[PDB]
Symmetry: C3
Subunit: 491 residues, 3 copies
């Protein structure tokens, strides 16, 4: 009657979410946000990276100049996309260390080609084949020059091309392995012999090996492809007596952020920074479980399919009914703040949100969101992470490196979220405790702690009086005489 | 006389253990558990993984079919164990990229072999040697076919074997390098010439090189071993004019969780999930310092030989003697709880454990144990981590990858244990503080804090009264008049 | 008048430093220390590691014995330093897998060479060239022996060298590729043919390839360099009919902590444990941003250029003026302690530092400094991390491994510093709170909390009385009657 009650409390919601902390495997909080990206739209967005869709062509087919790849001449990319349907449709070939040539062209990001005038005096140039049709005519790789005898002579070639440019030159060349001794003589006028391609700093010698291989598009012969990089001030020398598939010039070789990806995802007219083989993915979240193959500003790949970051305090049911405070009890009816006051006095029972404490909690949570959301880092050309052939040692190491990396990031992600969630529970608990302590200090000897998050105020404390406490302007001296008389009375 | 004392406290033990936290390099707690496995039984348990003990045979010798390895035909394994005593006892051979063939067969996990009928018309089959005895008779590798001239002719071989199966085929074949020109002619009727083994997608040409090597089991010649994998719908073509050591068929090549390990540990009849070269190790702990080479569900390798996880609160000696509470003081005599009450009243001096607070602490500690104990993850075929030969670049990278991984896990382990131990000290301190605070709130104006973890209760508080406080049913109003009179009296 | 005031507080400084914690991106503390080393002196200190400055010689040139490298014979190193100005000045050569031979010699750490007496009966030894002058005379690599015909005969060589030592032998040898058929005959009396160098466990066959390469120091021919390691109990066999560049003996091959580094930094007479290409760096700090290439006891490379570790409490401005305590308020005038007391009584206004709380904070901060400062770990030979040529697959993997490692350490560093800084703020806040709580408990019913970190003491409390509180010897009973009368009076 001659007293009032003031309770300190916090909000609660009817639909909380479970998160993990250091203390609890499962604790319900008022709200959380997902930190693992697990979906893609399923398309690769054509912006803001320059995409080159290989369609039916591998990068190596586009490099050599398979007729169906003619439209790729001189093009550049940030990301070359190779399709599973891609197929070769020219003379059958192989590339010793195919993976390396693919990688180095991919990383260079350009098919720019400059023709050069080699001196092929004494031989027939521009050999063609029915296995490599261009506009329904017998043809050959656009960037290569099939040399054969002239008037049944093939004089020894000893041909030079200096690099007088200020940039490196990439030369692609080949050796023809004929199916039979008959074809060797028919083509090069004499028995097969080695090809030597050299510079001041390197030498490569290749021996043609005559023999039938299983027919590919009806051809039992093969071309083996080689490459040579020539520095400024160095000189290419080509030395051969037959079987040379000659370069027509050089590719520019650049450095930058280009790569290549295997994917069947359609290319869309849209804008997304992070590309995976499954399609582009949003990069707001710090982690993702879509694909360990990525290009661009991407979330880091982890094994988890979900990691929930708490964005609110512990969610605690309201106890069924006298008003009561935060001790084992949240307030579902408090909707305009996270913390606040309930009172009972001469004028009724009321509630008010505390703005300061609410904002302190929200600001800290927004702070950690700002550290974690929209802060992905870019990666470009990396290592391959899926393999179509069995290879042993090198592949074992590539796979182990990647597995090692993923487990370490998955661990970091698990620990980070547990630590942050513990900190969020701690900081939100702390704001409640601080509010209660501040109030206790204001009240001095005029109130007692009832043990339920409420004070029994031992004087008449009307709406303005309660407001003075909430506003931090309550003068304990004004009421102390009244309060002491009420507290320390014999009953 | 007209008062009582109620002290809040916690247990202590005479034999505490030192752990590390974020705050302290060394702090004594009541109990701890070891998180680094540092011993092995010294034997490899034959369950639950399928173990194949190579005995005197390497995997490659068992593959080729060295007579002493005949018992291995067609066997499978999860883990092939190669012994240091193993030795070859057939024709001397080498394998270019031995490590890769070993790895790929190891990972495949099967020696299943299917014979095929190759057409070797025109040559003598089944050549043998005194260097490869089988049942005291001259013999040869079981899976290989040594072809030699027939009637002093060796017609050119051009032999095909299509893969019309729905699975890949692994072919193992070889080239014989004779010791002398005499042996070349004696065996193959003509001067040495290249061997070409091809498919639609690959080609391998090998040149026999005649010459003496140092004698091995009295043989100066050598066989070099090669392999070819043939896909469904592809075709093996073998083309040769001498020196061919032919396949008799193909190996199945499978994918799964198989590997190979070098170890001299005996195989025992027992059951253990984690295998190391030192023997099987228990996998209850999250870390281990036994060996960085592992197979199965294993603790992670770290450099530390011990990491102790606190499983109890700070251990604090009892001060020598009036009762006293937890302030700089533990209770060795409290044995039925971790926290509790001591009192002095009209009826004597008593102690009671507080079950709730004790269980809260124990449950949280059991929670972190459940996260850390018995939760190891499986790894299977990885990379090699010990090397018998000097190799340079590739080996440097294999070693660096592993060193990198171990240092990162060792760091994670060190930080994890420090963080968890800090949290355990914090949570156990917290339960003590909470118990004291709850009691303070119950007592209201009827008691004062004596500063030593005890309350001076300013009314007669008999055994039932004390029990009411411990049980949370104490009604402060019943005693308030008495208590206020005693507290606020002029003396 | 009949009362006193006692305030609890902590120091503040006029020049605080901003650090990052888990709670705050930016919080000012009284002091911090830098954990990332970002400068070098710019010189490589010649102590305590044994440094070998290659000057104009690569390690491989010093190994082969280019005349300008004669002074390097038989020398050892912990770190061989290769200079960008280095150049070859003998016969032009290449080394297939140059990187591996460089690495394995580097890691071995010795050029110790033992001559052996090979039986080269039937040929001319010690061939020389004007391209390799020694003391103005035609010469050749010191460790190699250029064999040519004798009286226009080159008999087949078949030469043996057993390893009867208890250590491994490293043999370096070569093949001469002549510029023309004329030179082949002039030098070796017959058409070129293979060289085979073998042991019981290995074989290497190399084919000389006649032809012009672009002239290097006027020479169109080349030597290709090979190596063979021979175990105890094994035997080297060299078999050749021309073009052999023979070994004169063997190199010791050792194991230990040696490496090689590319750097143009001058060598100084000074002592530093950590070497980078930029020069030696101090190793007090746990991290560094100078270079990811390191040798010795070095801080770990991270991407951050600064990480500041808090070494003091939150720095909080003093509020402008009655004395006041720590609530939103630090004391710039407290200079002999971190925490303490201010009082107002009958005898004036005074301040005293609290030694215990100050020392508790300082000891804990010194503890974490001792864990982090001067505790670097040693690494020696690793992998290469900069590349002068484009190579593809292997280089992609080397770069990815290193990028992976650096990002993981950079993450660990960021989290470590945030966690430690949070802990430092927490522990320093805690000492303040504990001091306030201890004081509150001493005062019992004789004082009230004014809400600003101060107590109103309700009795006359002169300088000695205040001292008794600070010293922990205050007897509340002495003053309780006076204090209760003053507190609970009607006004
Ligand atoms: C070595 O053996 C090879 C496999 O037996 C063989 O290749 C096969 O050659 C035949 C006959 O030339 C091809 O069959 C083709 O014959 C008719 C001719 O009218 C064509 O119109 C058809 O396209 C038909 O396919 C096979 O296609 C071919 N098989 C493979 C797997 O390539 C080689 O010719 C033999 N080598 C030598 C030098 O004789
Ligand atoms: C090239 O030189 C090789 C090493 O000198 C040589 O190998 C050696 O050959 C001898 C003689 O054949 C072997 O000695 C064996 O001789 C008796 C003959 O009754 C045997 O009963 C014994 O087993 C005895 O060991 C050596 O073992 C052998 N040494 C090595 C290291 O292999 C080659 O024969 C020479 N090559 C040519 C083509 O002549
Ligand atoms: C294959 O072609 C090569 C390049 O055209 C050629 O090498 C060049 O040879 C010429 C002439 O021998 C050298 O020129 C030198 O000639 C005078 C002779 O008095 C010297 O005094 C000078 O040093 C002058 O440089 C070139 O230096 C050389 N070019 C290169 C790039 O090496 C080969 O000789 C040809 N091979 C064959 C077998 O004929
Ligand atoms: C590299 O080119 C040279 C020519 O510049 C070739 O050498 C000639 O070879 C023919 C027969 O093949 C001989 O009749 C000539 O006498 C050689 N000329 C000279 C100047 O020596 C050489 O064969 C070529 N090498 C290769 C591997 O193709
Ligand atoms: C691959 O097989 C073919 C036969 O199918 C070999 O070619 C024959 O070689 C002999 C002499 O070696 C010649 O007399 C024949 O004229 C060739 N036959 C045909 C049909 O061309 C060939 O030598 C084999 N290749 C290898 C590398 O062993
Ligand atoms: C390895 O050495 C042997 C000699 O020990 C060489 O074999 C001789 O070769 C010549 C002609 O080159 C023949 O006239 C002899 O009959 C051979 N001697 C014997 C004992 O067989 C052989 O050529 C050498 N090999 C190489 C690759 O150089
Ligand atoms: C939950 O948290 C997120 C992140 O702060 C916020 O965007 C979202 O609106 C919140 N949801 C509710 C219902 O408050
Ligand atoms: C790719 O090849 C397929 C199959 O021949 C063909 O139908 C399609 O038109 C080709 N696409 C392009 C873009 O050339
Ligand atoms: C992405 O593709 C990979 C590889 O095919 C597949 O494992 C994964 O389920 C895909 N993820 C999504 C979200 O589509
Ligand atoms: C602010 O303080 C005044 C003065 O005591 C008080 O009457 C008023 O109700 C307060 N306003 C609030 C709590 O909104
Ligand atoms: C110490 O802790 C472990 C793990 O909880 C427990 O199994 C063991 O019994 C404890 N020892 C004692 C003496 O309490
Ligand atoms: C392995 O070889 C040794 C030495 O010859 C022999 O004593 C032993 O019986 C062999 N073991 C088996 C299982 O064949
Ligand atoms: C296991 O074997 C390794 C390699 O021989 C050795 O370094 C280590 O001491 C062994 N550990 C134990 C516990 O036996
Ligand atoms: C439980 O509460 C009752 C009622 O006050 C009390 O008398 C009794 O002793 C308590 N039991 C305990 C503490 O075991
Ligand atoms: C700041 O901290 C460092 C590390 O403890 C200490 O050496 C230095 O003297 C301190 N500076 C000041 C001004 O206290
Ligand atoms: C290194 O070579 C340069 C350029 O020829 C020369 O001037 C210098 O004397 C050489 N230095 C040494 C130490 O031989
Ligand atoms: C060290 O050298 C590297 C490579 O040249 C350079 O990136 C870096 O800026 C240098 N750092 C310092 C502190 O000199
Ligand atoms: C220590 O305690 C004594 C006894 O009460 C007190 O008078 C004295 O001032 C204290 N000394 C201090 C605080 O330095
Ligand atoms: C092929 O070479 C001929 C000369 O035989 C030349 O005229 C023509 O330009 C070449 N074809 C090209 C460049 O497409
Ligand atoms: C070896 O070939 C012969 C024919 O020369 C054949 O009869 C026999 O089965 C073969 N030996 C085997 C399969 O062990
Ligand atoms: C080169 O060989 C000759 C014999 O022709 C020998 O006398 C001399 O010692 C050798 N030169 C050396 C070892 O420098």
């Amino acid at each position: 009657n001659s007293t009032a009650t003031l309770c300190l409390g916090h909000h609660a919601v009817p639909n909380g979410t479970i998160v993990k902390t250091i203390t609890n495997d499962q604790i319900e909080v008022t709200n959380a946000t997902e930190l693992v990206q697990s979906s893609s739209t399923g398309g690769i967005c054509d912006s803001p990276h320059q995409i080159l869709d290989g369609e039916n062509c591998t990068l190596i087919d586009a490099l050599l100049g398979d007729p169906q790849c003619d439209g790729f001449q001189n093009k550049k990319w940030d990301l070359f996309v190779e399709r599973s349907k891609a197929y070769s449709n020219c003379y059958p070939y192989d590339v010793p260390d195919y993976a390396s040539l693919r990688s180095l062209v991919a990383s260079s990001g350009t098919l720019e080609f400059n023709n050069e005038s080699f001196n092929w005096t004494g031989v027939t140039q521009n050999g063609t084949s029915s296995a490599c049709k261009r506009r329904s005519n017998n043809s050959f790789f656009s960037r290569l020059n099939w040399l054969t005898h002239l008037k049944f002579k093939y004089p020894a070639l000893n041909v030079t091309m200096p690099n007088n440019e200020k940039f490196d030159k990439l030369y692609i060349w080949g050796v023809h392995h004929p199916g039979t001794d008959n074809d060797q003589i028919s083509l090069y006028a004499q028995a097969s012999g080695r090809i030597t391609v050299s510079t001041k700093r390197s030498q490569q010698t290749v021996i043609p090996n005559i023999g039938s291989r299983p027919r590919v598009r009806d051809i039992p012969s093969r071309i083996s492809i080689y490459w040579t990089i020539v520095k400024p001030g160095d000189i290419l020398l080509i030395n051969s007596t037959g079987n040379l598939i000659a370069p027509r010039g050089y590719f520019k070789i650049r450095s930058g952020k280009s790569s290549i990806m295997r994917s069947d995802a359609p290319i869309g007219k849209c804008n997304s920074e992070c590309i995976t083989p499954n399609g582009s993915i949003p990069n707001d979240k710090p982690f993702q479980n879509v694909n360990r193959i990525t290009y661009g500003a991407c979330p880091r790949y982890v094994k988890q399919n979900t990691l929930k970051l708490a964005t609110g305090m512990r969610n605690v049911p309201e106890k069924q009914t006298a008003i009561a405070g935060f001790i084992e009890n949240g307030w579902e009816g408090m909707v305009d703040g996270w913390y606040g006051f309930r009172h009972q006095n001469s004028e009724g029972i009321g509630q008010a949100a505390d703005l300061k404490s609410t904002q302190a909690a929200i600001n800290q949570i927004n702070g950690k969101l700002n550290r974690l959301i929209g802060k992905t880092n870019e990666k470009f050309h990396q290592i391959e992470k899926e393999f179509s052939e069995v290879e042993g040692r090198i592949q074992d190491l590539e796979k182990y490196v990647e597995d090692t990396k993923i487990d370490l990031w998955s661990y970091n992600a698990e620990l980070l979220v547990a630590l942050e969630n513990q900190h969020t529970i701690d900081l939100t608990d702390s704001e409640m405790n601080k509010l209660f302590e501040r109030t206790k200090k204001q009240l001095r000897e005029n109130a007692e702690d009832m043990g339920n998050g409420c004070f029994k105020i031992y004087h008449k404390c009307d709406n303005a009086c309660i407001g003075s406490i909430r506003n931090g302007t309550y003068d304990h001296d004004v009421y102390r005489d009244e309060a002491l008389n009420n507290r320390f009375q014999i009953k």
